[model samples]
Target: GRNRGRLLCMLALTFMFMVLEVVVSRVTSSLAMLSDSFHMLSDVLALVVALVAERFARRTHATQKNTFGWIRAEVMGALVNAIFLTGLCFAILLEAIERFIEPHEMQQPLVVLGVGVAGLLVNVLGLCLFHHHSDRAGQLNMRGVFLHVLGDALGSVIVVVNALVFYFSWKGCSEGDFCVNPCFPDPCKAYEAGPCWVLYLDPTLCVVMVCILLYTTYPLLKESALILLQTVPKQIDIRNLIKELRNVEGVEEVHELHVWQLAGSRIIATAHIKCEDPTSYMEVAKTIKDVFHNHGIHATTIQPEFA
Candidate 1:
């Protein structure tokens, strides 16, 4: 319930910020702001996906067509979120590259700075809401959304810093003044020795933000893809699981072992076990259920056969 409430709050916040960023980007002619706006758009979609997935997750009943009741929606949402963010990162990277190749005057530093500060506040609140849910064992959807907000938070900070540098440079120094850092290695040669050289900060920070987004979301992409492919979950130890099942008394053999996760922390297993005597099947099955229960596996199917 707490997570659901947090998700709802983040959804509204992201949507509001998305619109704000779009307007600010258009006013300032800031590619970084545009990039951040697009990223926020992705975040909005991600929040919606997560909210829907969580709703699906909360329902215990399922229909015949969808036996799992859309439980895998969480993983699917995570997958889409990762892919979407990755694309946005690359898009921003390309745009930043073009800006570096053909430098232009960055405008509206005050607006950028003010908007970034507001964005930072929103992101910080969103981060606190999802902090507890970003642990290793947390839900995939929550973790994915958390990372999205993390990138936005970092981007906001970068924007704030860049805007501050440019604003102060423009106000404090002139072309003939002693500029501390000559914006070399960039095409801002016209203002190379002056305050306006700081115009390069916008594209440079865009590149940095893209790097952060890619780095953070890559692992999520891999994990969600693996889950969607039905690969064995990372936390499960197959060897230990097999040994534990084989160690059961009145059991001669165990085979057909299969284990998978339906969602976060929801492990389902099906196995076939051979008992020394069919008479003890009930007792062995009960014992197996107890063992699985202790191991956090509540949904299980055990088929006992005489060996």
Candidate 2:
């Protein structure tokens, strides 16, 4: 519940920045600003889905019709968030490439600078809000949210840097003598005219930010997909689990062992154990249950059969 409240707050903050940054990007003609705005947009959607997943996760208790309830909803949400993140990164990359071919001078350096600072401050606050619940090892959906915020915070820093670069590098020509040809013999540094080389920083930083997001989001996508597919978690060893079950006293063999995750931190297992004596079924079942508990398999079913 506490985490959900924080997520909601983070969502509101992200949406606010998303709107503000879009306007700033349009006015400033900053690819970095636009990229960061899209990053924030993805965060807004991610946080919304995460909050809904949390609500569904609370109803994991099985009904007569649904054996596992909606526990998988969290994993599904994480997967969806990852897909959007990847798509957004690709879109940003394409936009950056377009600007790479034809650079455009920023119209309002001061606006970009001011808005970048504001974005940085907002992202810092978002980091604080989500840091406590951002354990990737425990919660997949929370990890997705955390990654989005982390990427956005990094993107904000890059935007600020780009703003600073543009402000200082281009402020020299902002006066009435609006020329940037240091090669020209004219008083205003006029030239045969070439694109503002410095403005390329905006698109370059956009590409760099997209690369960073792809690096971080790829593993998340794979992990979430694995969970959705009901694959055995990589952290659990099937061979070791089978061996442990077979080691239980009065258990002659273990077969039909299966283990899979229902959601983050929820591992369920089922196995058929052949026992030397049917009379010792109770003892063998208790022993296997204890072993599974030790291995963090809370939800388990152990079938005992006479050899």
Candidate 3:
């Protein structure tokens, strides 16, 4: 499938960047690089989880125990990604705050610049891959990775800007007070010495990249986690589902209805029904499918009984 191949591409891209980030961090010993590496690692984990879940779902078959085997695999994957990314976020914050207390100066800005460039390239590849997949169905898993990769690429741009600042300001002979590295001025002294603020922006811009990541990913993770916990689909109205099912011609009552997301935009449902006529089983089944269609749920299972 298009989504499967594309998801593989994303996973491959993420793994490549992860290797690069780890190597760069090892040589430079930069916390920023390490943190970003952790972030990229999450992307790889997410892609792998998505791919595995997709494969399992394809192999799943109807059984006496589970008529819809592995249907929730993708949802479970999304939930795990959510938790992993959330933890990555907290780690970033913790490290950043520690930097505020005991600052570390970077030895090679060029290393950061080179790795950031590489990360940007991989991110572009991943974005194109997922964008291509999104035009079809079943690629929604890849879509989530695309968004993350794009955001990380943008973050790398900030790292590159920091590198450029370090590259230029350090000449052969430094001025009396304006020497290169963190031992320079008092206000912006922290980052300049080691991992200080490289950009010439105000304090707001200093933390802007990290803040953007928190805003963009935290809510999505939260929502996906809710679904994995089987808390019911937040986007669906239970009352609406019940009302629609009850209104069906052969359905006298609806009970034990369950609706959930299997992945990004992939929804599933199950219900037990009391129907008017024993001979109208086919009609009841069609009516149940219609109800799901009307409500925009794409996959469902209905078990009917006579009241």
Candidate 4:
């Protein structure tokens, strides 16, 4: 419950920053700032879905309608969030490239600079909120949310730098070949469109943040997909597990074995043991259970047959 409270705090803080960046992006015409908000918005969607899924997971229990209850709800949450990030990451990348073609005259650099600092602080504060796992499944889900904020922190830094560069090199906005900037006489605007070189940074950083977001999200997608497909947890060595089971004292051979974790600590396994002595069948099964437990497969069953 306390962890739930922490997630809510992080969610609220993240939403606030997202709004701030997106709104101010208009005033500043900042592609970098908008992309940062895009990053935050994905986290917003992620946090919301994850929270909803978690509530469903906790409230649902083993019943006639569902034997596994709503445990997969947690995995679904992570999968959905990963998909959202991947989609949004590519969308923003496309937009950034378009911005590169015809760079917008950065409307007001100092404004975005100030807003960037505000976003930076919010992201930093958010990082602290989820700083502290498994009530492994719960913690695993929570970690995804934390990393989103971590990416936001990096995005915030990029916006700040983009804005800073624009603010300094700002000769002034121009019109065609004429300097339309308010202070017409300012020597900085003497050339057409204040230093064109500085205008590229905003979109450039937007693409960098896009790549970063994708890199971080790849593992979530791969892992969640693996879990949803009911593949063995990557850390477990199935070969070793089976080999060890064959060594049981009363067993001749073991087969029909399967192992998988639905989610979190909900590991399950089943095996058929070919036995030599009928009397030792029960003892053999018990030893195999111990083996499963040692390998972290807590919920397991062994069926023994006499040779």
Candidate number achieving the greatest lDDT relative to the actual structure: 1
Least well predicted 10-residue stretch by lDDT in candidate 3: 133-142
lDDT of 4 by residue, 1-307 (tens): 7767877887777677667767777766658767656655656677887788778778557788778788877778778777777777777788889878766666556776687688788888877876773156676676577667777788779978887777777766565554564323344542445666776787888888888788777887888888888788866898887788777677778768888887877688877878876755666677777887788888887776665
Worst 10 residues of 1 by lDDT: 179-188
TM-score to true structure, per model: 0.77, 0.79, 0.65, 0.82
Clashes (backbone N, CA, C under 3 Å), per candidate, total 0, 0, 6, 0
Better of 1 and 4 by TM-score: 4
Pairs that clash in candidate 1: none
- Give the true-structure RMSD of model 4: 5.0
Candidate 3 off by > 4 Å? 13-43, 132-140, 170-206, 229-307
Cα displacement (Å) at residue 232, model 4? 2.1
lDDT tens digits, residues 1-307, model 1?
8888888877888778788878877777778778657656766677787778777765567788877776677777788778877877777788789988766655567887788899999999989888876622236777788888898799889878977786667653324665433443543455234655566677877887887778777888888887767667776677887888787777777869888777667778988888777655777789999988887678999887665
Query: Model 3: number of clashes?
Result: 6
Instruction: Give the local distance difference test score of model 3.
Output: 0.64
Per-residue lDDT, model 4, residue 127, is: 79
lDDT of 3 by residue, 149-252 (tens): 65667666766676677687544233366555544344353322443444233223336766776677666566656766667665678876788778777677
Worst 10 residues of 2 by lDDT: 183-192
Deviation from native of the Cα of residue 9 in model 4, angstroms: 2.1
Better of 1 and 4 by lDDT: 1
